Amino acid sequence: TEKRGRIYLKAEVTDEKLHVTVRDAKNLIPMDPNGLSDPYVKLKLIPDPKNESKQKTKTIRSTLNPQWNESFTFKLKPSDKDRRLSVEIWDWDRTTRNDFMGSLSFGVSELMKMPASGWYKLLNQEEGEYYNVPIPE
Ligand SMILES: [Ca+2]
Ligand SMILES: [Ca+2]
Structure with a gap:
């Protein structure tokens, strides 16, 4: 999708419960000596x-094009309207610290207005906590 690849997510707020589905990613950056990486996604309310x-x-x-097809739920509170859903892809390393691969973030309020669904561009770690850029096709 750009520099760090892309990921397909679904996220809608439907209780005071936040549902997120991480499907798959594409064109991730190789973070290992063998030209690949071992991705996993971290979700956090920040x-x-x-x-x-x-x-x-x-x-x-x-793999650089993983398919997780995993879902998660977050119990929400009024104190969570100002927080953001953080989505980061990391590369699992056994003999060293894991390597950051890409990120995004949605404002909870944002997700309450309209759910997120589709491909998103993976950003750098610092900017990732501030915004998301959707991809059409
Ligand atoms: Ca690595
Ligand atoms: Ca690795």
């Missing part, structure tokens, strides 16, 4: 002072 909202998909080894 800011998260106590580190209590971290959810994570399974890790898929040796």
